[PDB]
Design an enzyme around this catalytic site. Sequence first.
Site, PDB file in Angstrom:
ATOM      1  N   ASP A   8      33.055  36.340  13.507  1.00  0.00           N
ATOM      2  CA  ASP A   8      31.922  37.199  13.184  1.00  0.00           C
ATOM      3  C   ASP A   8      31.970  38.144  14.403  1.00  0.00           C
ATOM      4  OD1 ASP A   8      29.288  38.153  12.329  1.00  0.00           O
ATOM      5  OD2 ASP A   8      28.582  37.074  14.142  1.00  0.00           O
ATOM      6  N   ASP A  10      28.907  40.575  15.721  1.00  0.00           N
ATOM      7  CA  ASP A  10      27.603  40.712  16.436  1.00  0.00           C
ATOM      8  C   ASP A  10      27.059  39.381  16.866  1.00  0.00           C
ATOM      9  OD1 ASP A  10      27.750  43.579  15.826  1.00  0.00           O
ATOM     10  OD2 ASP A  10      26.956  43.099  13.846  1.00  0.00           O
ATOM     11  N   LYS A  45      19.690  38.061  11.381  1.00  0.00           N
ATOM     12  CA  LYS A  45      21.001  38.004  12.048  1.00  0.00           C
ATOM     13  C   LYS A  45      22.134  37.826  11.041  1.00  0.00           C
ATOM     14  CE  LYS A  45      19.993  36.225  16.801  1.00  0.00           C
ATOM     15  NZ  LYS A  45      20.051  35.014  17.748  1.00  0.00           N
ATOM     16  N   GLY A  46      23.156  38.702  11.119  1.00  0.00           N
ATOM     17  CA  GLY A  46      24.323  38.623  10.251  1.00  0.00           C
ATOM     18  C   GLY A  46      24.154  39.116   8.824  1.00  0.00           C
ATOM     19  N   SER A 114      32.920  40.391   9.498  1.00  0.00           N
ATOM     20  CA  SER A 114      31.627  40.987   9.840  1.00  0.00           C
ATOM     21  C   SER A 114      31.089  41.788   8.692  1.00  0.00           C
ATOM     22  CB  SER A 114      31.819  41.893  11.063  1.00  0.00           C
ATOM     23  OG  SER A 114      30.666  42.615  11.427  1.00  0.00           O
ATOM     24  N   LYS A 144      25.966  37.867   3.819  1.00  0.00           N
ATOM     25  CA  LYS A 144      25.836  36.480   4.287  1.00  0.00           C
ATOM     26  C   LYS A 144      24.349  36.194   4.000  1.00  0.00           C
ATOM     27  CE  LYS A 144      29.316  37.278   8.000  1.00  0.00           C
ATOM     28  NZ  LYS A 144      29.604  37.301   9.465  1.00  0.00           N
ATOM     29  N   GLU A 168      30.494  31.654  14.397  1.00  0.00           N
ATOM     30  CA  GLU A 168      29.234  32.326  14.093  1.00  0.00           C
ATOM     31  C   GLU A 168      28.062  32.006  15.022  1.00  0.00           C
ATOM     32  OE1 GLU A 168      27.427  34.287  12.259  1.00  0.00           O
ATOM     33  OE2 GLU A 168      28.780  35.141  10.808  1.00  0.00           O
ATOM     34  N   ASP A 169      27.105  32.932  15.093  1.00  0.00           N
ATOM     35  CA  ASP A 169      25.900  32.774  15.922  1.00  0.00           C
ATOM     36  C   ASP A 169      24.655  32.764  15.051  1.00  0.00           C
ATOM     37  OD1 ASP A 169      26.270  35.586  15.253  1.00  0.00           O
ATOM     38  OD2 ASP A 169      24.563  36.019  16.571  1.00  0.00           O
TER      39      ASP A 169
HETATM   40  O1  LIG Z   1      26.357  47.538   8.822  1.00  0.00           O
HETATM   41  P1  LIG Z   1      25.548  47.558  10.147  1.00  0.00           P
HETATM   42  O2  LIG Z   1      24.217  48.358   9.922  1.00  0.00           O
HETATM   43  O3  LIG Z   1      26.388  48.186  11.310  1.00  0.00           O
HETATM   44  O4  LIG Z   1      25.238  45.975  10.440  1.00  0.00           O
HETATM   45  C1  LIG Z   1      24.573  45.137   9.510  1.00  0.00           C
HETATM   46  O5  LIG Z   1      25.162  43.819   9.677  1.00  0.00           O
HETATM   47  C2  LIG Z   1      25.053  43.272  11.008  1.00  0.00           C
HETATM   48  C3  LIG Z   1      25.795  41.898  11.012  1.00  0.00           C
HETATM   49  O6  LIG Z   1      25.649  41.387  12.285  1.00  0.00           O
HETATM   50  C4  LIG Z   1      23.557  43.084  11.387  1.00  0.00           C
HETATM   51  O7  LIG Z   1      22.867  42.091  10.587  1.00  0.00           O
HETATM   52  C5  LIG Z   1      22.840  44.492  11.216  1.00  0.00           C
HETATM   53  O8  LIG Z   1      21.444  44.380  11.471  1.00  0.00           O
HETATM   54  C6  LIG Z   1      23.074  45.046   9.817  1.00  0.00           C
HETATM   55  O9  LIG Z   1      22.453  46.358   9.677  1.00  0.00           O
HETATM   56 MG   LIG Z   2      26.482  37.505  14.176  1.00  0.00          MG
END
Ligand SMILES: O=P(O)(O)O[C@H]1O[C@H](CO)[C@H](O)[C@H](O)[C@H]1O
Ligand SMILES: [Mg+2]
Length: 219
Positions: A8, A10, A45-46, A114, A144, A168-169
């Site tokens: 993952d 972030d 998160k995620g 991700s 996810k 994963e976190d």
């Molecule tokens: O597609 P992004 O906006 O760059 O990223 C998207 O997914 C990431 C996964 O870590 C986070 O949950 C973020 O808040 C969400 O907007």
């Molecule tokens: Mg993450």
Amino acid sequence: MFKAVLFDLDGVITDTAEYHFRAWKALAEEIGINGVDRQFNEQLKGVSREDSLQKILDLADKKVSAEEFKELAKRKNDNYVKMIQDVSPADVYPGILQLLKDLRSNKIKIALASASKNGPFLLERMNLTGYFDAIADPAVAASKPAPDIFIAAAHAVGVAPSESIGLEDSQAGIQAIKDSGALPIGVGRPEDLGDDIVIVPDTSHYTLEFLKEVWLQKQ
Ligand SMILES: O=P(O)(O)O[C@H]1O[C@H](CO)[C@H](O)[C@H](O)[C@H]1O
Ligand SMILES: [Mg+2]
């Protein structure tokens, strides 16, 4: 015996889950929603961009137009993108770069799993692009907790999820790995991630030798 590691981004490779939280909280507050605190953020998160906005709107039972929905998601992304311009290789979490080099050295595939559409940019900021065999495209993938992103990452590197370990976190991501067939190793607090999987306190614990042992023990 595992043939791949599905990373993952972030919160695992670098501290970017923190900036996503800050930007979402800022967005929420602008539209009069104040419930986006760290406790609630465990649910975000995620999670993909659109699904995160929807989760925030749901908190307050707010409804917006399709055009305002796109404007809100874009505003948050614009803020986040500004926040990460200075992300550098010094920001790679401890142990991650050495893990990438050791996995490479042992011919183990490396994939990014991700949901973030800002993933490629971040790997470039961190000079990590060259260590990855493939990036699972988030743009053909459900958010996810769905196992979709992890299933796509494993196949992007020609491996089955059952022959892979996922790192994963988040609560959503751990569940995604579990349903993918891959073996999860979480990073963070047991209070947030659970007690049924293998969990490490920080990423310095993600070493090739630890991963090999967890794999030996699943058997
Ligand atoms: O597609 P992004 O906006 O760059 O990223 C998207 O997914 C990431 C996964 O870590 C986070 O949950 C973020 O808040 C969400 O907007
Ligand atoms: Mg993450």
